[PDB]
A paper describes a structure:
Here, we present the structure of a low-passage, European TBEV subtype (Kuutsalo-14) solved with cryo-EM and single-particle reconstruction to a resolution of 3.3 Å. The merged K3 datasets gave a final reconstruction with a resolution of 3.3 Å. The asymmetric unit contains three E–M heterodimers. Superimposition of the three E–M heterodimers within the asymmetric unit, based on the E protein ectodomains, indicated conformational differences between the M proteins located on the two-fold (chain D), three-fold (chain E), and five-fold (chain F) symmetry axes. The major conformational differences between the three M proteins arise due to the different locations of Asp23 and Ser24 that diverge by up to 2.8 Å at the Cα. As phosphatidylcholine (PC) is the most common lipid species found in flavivirus virions, we built PC headgroups and the first four carbon atoms of each fatty acid tail.
Tick-borne encephalitis virus (TBEV) is a member of the Flavivirus genus, and belongs in the family Flaviviridae. The fundamental building block of the virion is a heterotetramer made up of two M–E dimers.
Numbering used by the authors:
A (entry chain B), B (entry chain A), C (entry chain C): 1 to 494
D (entry chain E), F (entry chain D): 1 to 74
E (entry chain F): 1 to 73
Write the structure that this text describes.
Amino acid sequence: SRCTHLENRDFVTGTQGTTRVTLVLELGGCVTITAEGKPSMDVWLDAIYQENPAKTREYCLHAKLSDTKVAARCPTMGPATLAEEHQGGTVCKRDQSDRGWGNHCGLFGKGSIVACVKAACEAKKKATGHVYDANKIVYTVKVEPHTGDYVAANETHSGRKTASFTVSSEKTILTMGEYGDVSLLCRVASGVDLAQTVILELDKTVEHLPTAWQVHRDWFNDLALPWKHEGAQNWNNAERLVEFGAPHAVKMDVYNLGDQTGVLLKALAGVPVAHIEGTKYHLKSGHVTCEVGLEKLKMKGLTYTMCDKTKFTWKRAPTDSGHDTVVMEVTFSGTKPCRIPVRAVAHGSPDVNVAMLITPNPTIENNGGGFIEMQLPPGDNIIYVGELSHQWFQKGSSIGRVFQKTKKGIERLTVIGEHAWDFGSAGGFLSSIGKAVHTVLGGAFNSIFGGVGFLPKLLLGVALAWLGLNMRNPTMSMSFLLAGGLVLAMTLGV
Amino acid sequence: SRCTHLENRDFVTGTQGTTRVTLVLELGGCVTITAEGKPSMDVWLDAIYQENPAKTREYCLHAKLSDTKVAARCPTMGPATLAEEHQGGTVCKRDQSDRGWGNHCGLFGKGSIVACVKAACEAKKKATGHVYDANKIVYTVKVEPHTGDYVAANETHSGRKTASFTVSSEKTILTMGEYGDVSLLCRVASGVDLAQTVILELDKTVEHLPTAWQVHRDWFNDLALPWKHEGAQNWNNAERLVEFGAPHAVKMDVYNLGDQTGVLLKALAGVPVAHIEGTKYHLKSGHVTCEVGLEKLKMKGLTYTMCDKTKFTWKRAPTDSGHDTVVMEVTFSGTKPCRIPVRAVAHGSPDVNVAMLITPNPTIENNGGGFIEMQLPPGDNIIYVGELSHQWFQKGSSIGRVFQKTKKGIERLTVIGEHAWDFGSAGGFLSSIGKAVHTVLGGAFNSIFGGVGFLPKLLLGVALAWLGLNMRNPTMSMSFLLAGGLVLAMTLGV
Amino acid sequence: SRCTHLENRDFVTGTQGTTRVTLVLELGGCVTITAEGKPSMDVWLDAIYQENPAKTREYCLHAKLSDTKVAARCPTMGPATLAEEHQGGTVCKRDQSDRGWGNHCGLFGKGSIVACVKAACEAKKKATGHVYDANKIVYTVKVEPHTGDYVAANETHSGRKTASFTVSSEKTILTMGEYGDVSLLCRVASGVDLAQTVILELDKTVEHLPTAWQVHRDWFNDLALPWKHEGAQNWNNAERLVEFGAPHAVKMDVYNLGDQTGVLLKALAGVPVAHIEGTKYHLKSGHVTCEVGLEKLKMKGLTYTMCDKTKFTWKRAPTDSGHDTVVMEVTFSGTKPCRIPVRAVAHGSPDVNVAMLITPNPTIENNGGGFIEMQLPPGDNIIYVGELSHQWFQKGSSIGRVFQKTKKGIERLTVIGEHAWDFGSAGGFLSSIGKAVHTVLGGAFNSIFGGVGFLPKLLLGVALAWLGLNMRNPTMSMSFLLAGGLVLAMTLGV
Amino acid sequence: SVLIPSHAQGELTGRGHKWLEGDSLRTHLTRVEGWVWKNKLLALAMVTVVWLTLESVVTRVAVLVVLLCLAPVY
Amino acid sequence: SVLIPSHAQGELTGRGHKWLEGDSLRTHLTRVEGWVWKNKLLALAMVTVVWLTLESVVTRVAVLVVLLCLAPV
Amino acid sequence: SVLIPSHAQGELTGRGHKWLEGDSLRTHLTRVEGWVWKNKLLALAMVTVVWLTLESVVTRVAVLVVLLCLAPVY
């Protein structure tokens, strides 16, 4: 199946007789959902995108200057003036210069000078920003059944099915041939917080650069650069990129601060990448919450006869997948449609079959089948397929597996936030309480420290720790210690 | 007299029997030399320059990339190898990436991948540094006789003379006609410290940007940018502008950090400007110490007859100068060669003459003119030229003049350091002790706090004052408090 | 019985309540398994080998240098460069040399110099590292019926049978002629850790050196020599063998540090030897845990009648074995097929028979005489074969036998480690507890002191003891001293 | 990443034109002001906690100054 | 002059490709360690001054930590 | 086994070219500093144990010097 390809994968099992299971799909991830007597499914989120989003204020990065003009008058007459000073698209400065008989004034002292220039952004040095509309965003989810066949990453799997969700059409049914029907419910209101994300374009034909960035809205609105809205002809605040030198008697210099691209791209350091492929603007990082209903699923070939035990052969020997699972591929030559008798035996025990199969009831069929994936307990084991056999030392330990999965859980919690509590739960009391406590505490923490640097956050944590330790009474001492500990813990964890 | 065209004018007065005087000549400044019985002189420094200076290593600011190549190998088949990795002009990086049956390999695990790209510098985006040679540098000093003519700043005075000093230059004499010879001896290598100055050229073609900068050598030699010398064909450390994304299974991306011109110009903020003219490289700052010999000067027209008291008229009425002096110009009708009778009296005391002329023995000549410059005491005065009379209120006060001179002395100390103790000095203990104490104290302070910066230096001053407060014993407590206060005061004043 | 040919031998007895037994066979060892109701068997591990294993890395031991180049530049100019600096297979260095008029330099000071040389390796002076593949390794086990005939070490015994275990193999049945069938299950990948060992090949055709060595992977990765992979053309880090002298004005010398084979062979002191045979790579140390099933083995010739007691004669009079047994050979001339009446009696009691026979039931047949190996208690005894008789004195004592077995046990435990608890194991508390505790404590100790030398280990032990004597009041002092003693003892006892 | 450090101020002097106005205490205070408006809630929190907990006026003033100066640069 | 402030680190996250590695604990530990190894003499001078002057273990730890963090300025 | 001892350094001197630089006090101190930087944690462990168990400053200095000098070889 597809989700053996990724570094990131997860497993969830429906408890005895459960009809549906809830998931949070993370873009660039996978979940394998399994239940007794139900065919195993791979479910993942493939794309989040919109066509021609809305625009927002557009910045400039490299100014082009023209028609420099200057005027000045002597040390006792009225201030100088230029017509361009009242027009649009011009930047001007007013200053005083020293003059005297040396340059044809009648008196010695401070005369007046004014300079003006015309400013327009260079051809391809704009920075456009876009925002998504919740009424138009498309989420695409894909589902794949565990047939007994394997296909590479550049090959078309015949069982792949697609469901596209908008704010309308929140629920869909997918039909999967012999395996039956599966139900998907995915409300977009639970997904990415669209109010706070902006897509930043720069120039998309520049090779060796990403096509777009996913910057934060508050950060985007604070940049000190020239800017305008779409269609307008005259830039606001060319002053930020045009600077003036000190004046001579009757002349004054206009300087251009140059292209800012290198400063901008250094500021964007930590921002996630986004993509553009035409009319379509893709996020490459996000998540959705869904409920999957399994009741309409059914097994294939459950009534077949067993294979001829002597006919099997390996096409690929068993190998470790890196997810604590073993993968195998078998070939067969007897009467074609039949059921494979795979099993595995632990050393030092009476031949009990201990394998847990991810692909249930494997079959061989006309021009298909043969792939197997299974989990074995730690230690020395033997694998049997009919008369064919192989050996396997399963590395690791039970406590190691528990720790590994706990670490994965902590990582998910810190990456997805409050929505992590909805992963794989049967709903109810524990999950609801966890989510409520998490959200109410996180809101306050985000309110007090949103946008602050990691170093100042750590520094305040240390200060609070010291001050609580030094506090004059126990209650306040503990309160300050707890506050410092909380800020330190969260800053170090994130 | 050119000295009237600028602020920063300095008056130096000798005494009868003074053979010669020492001056520190600065760009954008000038001195008028007055003597008890000899014509006044104008002396100033016009240019410090070299022709075709020697180069130093060039830096790139906008990388051009081409012909990316990528290769990879499976988790057990050893590291990847690519032909271009050993050539020149190429940037390469090798890393590990995940593999598995999803890709066309035998095992699941970390493989090897390597990527390379040809790097160059774009057509006109290279900063280049030049350094001066002490045996070729040229200083130009100019001297003007201070005749009674007046000439605008865009027009050439027929009497001024030029001295082009080099390391191979002796004491030189300038004739300047009837006024007699004047002598100059300028000590090259007494001025700008050429061992730590670099002229930075960015692109002399662009319109709205200064043509050169005078950066510090200790700052120029450490700079995170690709660099090479003039004759080399391939760049070193091109890896400073290219970046590489996290690898996929069989691909990884090459990124370009763009043009750095805007961050460079931001760093150069405080640097002084320089200039380029064809083959000539000019500084626009610096100073040189030079001795001027007045020995062979003579006054003109000493044997001429006195002009008629009548037959004068004004051409420009008396007006206030920028330097607390009065300037005027008169016309005469009659037999031309003669001496102007000029005097001034306090209102209500015609017996005493209070004028101090900057132009001794004013004359009118067959084709000359009647420019005059005077200093008068504060208050109400009358100016007489023959029988022409004019009233004049002289603003200011004696305390104000003393204050102005003291302030300018402080500024010269701030600008040229210990060399200030040589300005206009006849020698002796004041100059000797001042220069010795200044050089030693300044050397120590520069050794400790040379490159630390204003606000960090001020903060350390505050810390030192706090330490002096904290130290328990009163006497060194106070001494250290005084030390902290002194460092604070000096770092704030400079 | 091949067990007689070797210095090292071990006996294991199956009590009648058992039919399968656990062995850990050691390459170069040998074991006799016997049960009162079954014919005895000789089983040993013959070889561990692979064909054409993988190549990890290759080092070079004698650099070849060619086409030296050098260039220099004067102080006032940019550093020198050579094209060889940007090519494959070259090593280069740049430095500063003093120059002046004496070298046509034009100015006194430090210039620049650069030198380069092409580097390769001599035809036969490479060193190749090979690694095994767990899915291709072969273990050979051999079993011998203990026929009662005898043959020397350079002769082939008709009853000897072979088994070639691999990961593919499972429990195998060997048929042994009239004696029946025996079952073997060997657990490949439970023996030597293939992830830690590298087979190091220096050269095949040197007449007076071993063909291969076995070395540890952590050591082999840090050999600090020039290194490469098969098929790659240019060496990495030839700078480790080329060395550069200090420069003259315009010359620099390149030195070669020569052959390293001597220092390598001196560093390898203490590692096990390996072997190479055509395409096969053999280890010469290692072990395999196996379970051997004795059911369906049956006696030979129980139906025969007893021999003519008067006809026997000696062919090889009784002799003392190396393993505390007696060995003899008889000849007979009567009706050939018949059982040998062999017995022995202690001198103090003429009624009780005392012999214990390793041969299960000796008989003579049309071909093959009578070899007998038997055990007797310490003291004076008489051996009878029918009328033929001989007199024997058995050295040692029961206490000595117990002590010698204890020595054997300790030695095996020290050599093989954890697997010692499986030798002759049939489950049970003592065996299980021993293996568990040994695993835990041995792993803990190894993680701390793995790879550390004996002298540092002894010094740490002594220092810990001394610091315990020097330690503060609380009782934990004794534990500190005990820790030092423990590390010292565990270092000394091995 | 390319990291060009800002040129030192006091080592070079003259009377010709300078490229731009250098960094200064007024600039520092202006930047602090710009930061405070965006982070007012945390500003009030930091001022109130120290003003309440510490005992001496001068010490509180010093700590406030140090905190404000340190806040924006990172 | 125009100042484009650096983007906040933890406000926005996920599992896609990031642009470049932003300032983090690892980076700052590396910076302080390298700086100390660059300014050894000064580092030991400050450390010993504080350790000698300040009276209590916890306050010495706090002051040393803060100073080492701020040292690169 | 053949074991050629390292030539003594202090017994010969001159101003001509030497074959290859040998050991010296500064070289050993360089190796000590490099080792300490490589194994920071172990260095602090060794320092703290003795700082806690030995009361006399001179004794601590002596033991620390001995341990540091022996560290690179072991």
